Amino acid sequence: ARVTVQDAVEKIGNRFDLVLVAARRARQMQVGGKDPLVPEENDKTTVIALREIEEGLINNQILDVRERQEQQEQEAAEL
Amino acid sequence: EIKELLKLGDLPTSGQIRLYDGRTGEQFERPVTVGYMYMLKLNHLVDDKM
Amino acid sequence: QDVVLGLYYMTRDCVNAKGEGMVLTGPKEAERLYRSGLASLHARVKVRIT
Amino acid sequence: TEFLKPRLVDIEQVSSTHAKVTLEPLERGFGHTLGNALRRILLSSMPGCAVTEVEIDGVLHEYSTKEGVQEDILEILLNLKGLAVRVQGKDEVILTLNKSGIGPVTAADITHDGDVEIVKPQHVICHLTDENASISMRIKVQRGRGYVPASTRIHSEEDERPIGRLLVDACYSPVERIAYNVEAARVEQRTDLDKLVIEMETNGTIDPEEAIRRAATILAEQLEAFVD
Amino acid sequence: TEFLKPRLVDIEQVSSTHAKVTLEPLERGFGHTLGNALRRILLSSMPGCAVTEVEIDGVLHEYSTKEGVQEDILEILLNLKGLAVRVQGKDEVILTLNKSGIGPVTAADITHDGDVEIVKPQHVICHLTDENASISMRIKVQRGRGYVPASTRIHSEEDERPIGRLLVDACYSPVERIAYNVEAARVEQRTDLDKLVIEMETNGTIDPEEAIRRAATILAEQLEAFVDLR
Amino acid sequence: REEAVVWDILDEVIREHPVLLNRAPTLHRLGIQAFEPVLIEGKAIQLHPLV
Known part of the structure; x- marks a missing residue:
């Protein structure tokens, strides 16, 4: 979270992998513009990414599946 | 000689007095040493270093 | 260095001092007795501690 | 020249009787003035009613012993200190405790005058091991203020106290703990200002908030005498 | 609940400045509770009048000098910071000092307004060493509390002063030193009552009784938040 | 010009934004640590004693 990221590390299992996943999600929320899954609570997108990973709402597989779902739906909207 | 001087000015020959705290107003438990030390402002002004 | 001297001065003891051998109902009135x-x-x- | 009147921002009731009161902003160096003046008044001058003496049948000393009671006599007196009594009419009451059998002797089992209330009926005075053992004692609730330990009384009063008047520290003041803490208020106007945080905690006889109000009401009255 | 309230007994004015004001009778444990809150308020923030700007004739900045004047304009400004005035009615006055001839220029030579009292008229402002020398200066005296440095003012002031208006730092507060002793009072039955003796040392601009009245007023105003809580 | 809205924008942009403090010589990896700033009125960095 804000002070310690231990819970996120136990949820992913690797400091480095946690950084990569959290950066991907924060990029989604900062540029991609999509809404957070936890309340804002006046935090920078980085910390919302960490908080979401703390609750198990965001895992690398979850990010992959959401991205694939949206991309396949756009490809369906092509036709 | 230091202590003969401290006795001349009616000061604690131990050179160490009872200080009260400024905020809570209650005495510091055990005596503190107080006296005039000569300090020098050096040339390391944070204005020039920041 | 300063924090360790604070901890050492507080968690120490004496032969006969103010409040020698009374019983306290916990840490909170230990703090109350010290402050008072x-x-x-x-x-x-x-x-008594839990 | 009305100085800086603050705004109570946070009333964090952590428990039914333990609170945090955050109060910002104050003129620089007023956090300590107010916090310490309060803390001192709350600690050493709030009035309340507290147990002061106990006569236990079959006992003459605190270091003596009683069979059937799991606790020592010393632990019994210690349990009596943390008793939250509240008297309504008078400045002295004599309660009696009489229990028999097996089970915890909670405060709910005290013979009560109608005008004397007990805040915590679940405060365990002592335990009973054997069913043939019973406990009888005569407790003295007294009204006062501050905190007067046992030694002060035992050396102050010379009157012939009958053998059996085991003597208890009197926690008259209803404040279990108070600790203030002064942070810095980041105000656009000036940052030199400071904010006060008061972790208050009482016994149940009074709420924390009523306790702070009563403390402020005491100091105000003393200063009213000389404010003009 | 038998709280006995205190009452200013007398002002033991030892010296022109030293005043051992007595304050009795107090409950046990209140001599310090009042005493320290007072001391902090009296020394923390009390209102007084201080020289804020100076303006000497034909002087552009304080790092210069004057002909016939033994001090630099900086030493004159340091001698002016410690000017102890008492402004009766208004809130900002402008005094004028004009003197010529050999001798010390003291604060007794300020052409006094009607409602401006200089309590130490022997406070040497400056020295003139030439018979043809002359100093003419317009000293602005404000009222406030605390210590306001000149830099804070000029940063808070976007107005462009003329080149020649020297800017003195402002130490408004009149109370210099303050101590107290909690002695034991004498009452017929209550022997646990106290009495508080507050010794104040000032510039001579605040009257001790009025100083304590202001301090008690500030404390009572501030405690209103806790009394009428939320 | 340092308007008073610049300071509000600064306190908004500095929240949750870690900043690396370094001291040379950097003998070991604990010589460069990321803190989280608190804006203070002065010209000297303020360091937690324990670190």
Whole structure:
């Protein structure tokens, strides 16, 4: 979270992998513009990414599946 | 000689007095040493270093 | 260095000091007794703790 | 020249009787003035009613012993200190405790005058091991203020106290703990200002908030005498 | 609940400045509770009048000098900071000092307004060493509390002063030193009552009784938040 | 110009934004640590004693 990221590390299992996943999600929320899954609570997108990973709402597989779902739906909207 | 001087000015020959705290107003438990030390402002002004 | 001297001065003891051997109902009234000035910071005492 | 009147921002009730009161902003160096003046008044001058003496049948000393009671006599007196009594009419009451059998002797089992209330009926005075053992004692609730330990009384009063008047520290003041703490208020106007945080905690006889109000009401009255 | 309230007994004015004001009778444990809150308020913030700007004739900045004047304009400004005035009615006055001839220029030579009292008229402002020398200066005296440095003012002031208006730092507060002793009072039955003796040392601009009245007023105003809580 | 809205924008942009403090010589990896700033009125960095 804000002070310690231990819970996120136990949820992913690797400091480095946690950084990569959290950066991907924060990029989604900062540029991609999509809404957070936890309340804002006046935090920078980085910390919302960490908080979401703390609750198990965001895992690398979850990010992959959401991205694939949206991309396949756009490809369906092509036709 | 230091202590003969401290006795001349009616000061604690131990050179160490009872200080009260400024905020809570209650005495510091055990005596503190107080006296005039000569300090020098050096040339390391944070204005020039920041 | 300063924090360790603070901890050492507070968690120490004396032969006969203010509040020598009274019983306290916990840590909170130990703090109350010290602040009130009724017991010295380091004075042997029986306190119930959980 | 009305100085800086603050705004109570946070009333964090952590428990039914333990609170945090955050109060910002104050003129620089007023956090300590107010916090310490309060803390001192709350610690050493708030009035309340507290147990002061106990006569236990079959006992003459605190270091003596009683069979059937799991606790020592010393632990019994210690349990009596943390008794939250509240008297309504008078400045002295004599309660009696009489229990028999097996089970915890909670405060709910005290013979009560109608005008004397007990805040915590679940405060365990002592335990009973054997069913043939019973406990009888005569407790003295007294009204006062501050905190007067046992030694002060035992050396102050010379009157012939009958053998059996085991003597208890009197926690008259209803404040279990108070600790203030002064942070810095980041105000656009000036940052030199400071904010006060008061972790208050009482016994149940009074709420924390009523306790702070009563403390402020005491100091105000003393200063009213000389404010003009 | 038998709280006995205190009452200013007398002002033991030892010296022109030293005043051992007595304050009795107090409950046990209140001599310090009042005493320290007072001391902090009296020394923390009390209102007084201080020289804020100076303006000497034909002087552009304080790092210069004057002909016939033994001090630099900086030493004159340091001698002016410690000017102890008492402004009766208004809130900002402008005094004028004009003197010529050999001798010390003291604060007794300020052409006094009607409602401006200089309590130490022997406070040497400056020295003139030439018979043809002359100093003419317009000293602005404000009222406030605390210590306001000149830099804070000029940063808070976007107005462009003329080149020649020297800017003195402002130490408004009149109370210099203050101590107290909690002695034991004498009452017919209550022997646990106290009495508080506050010794104040000032510039001579605040009257001790009025100083304590202001301090008690500030404390009572501030405690209103806790009394009428939320 | 340092308007008073610049300071509000600064306190908004500095929240949750870690900043690396370094001291040379950097003998070991604990010589460069990321803190989280608190804006203070002065010209000297303020360091937690324990670190």
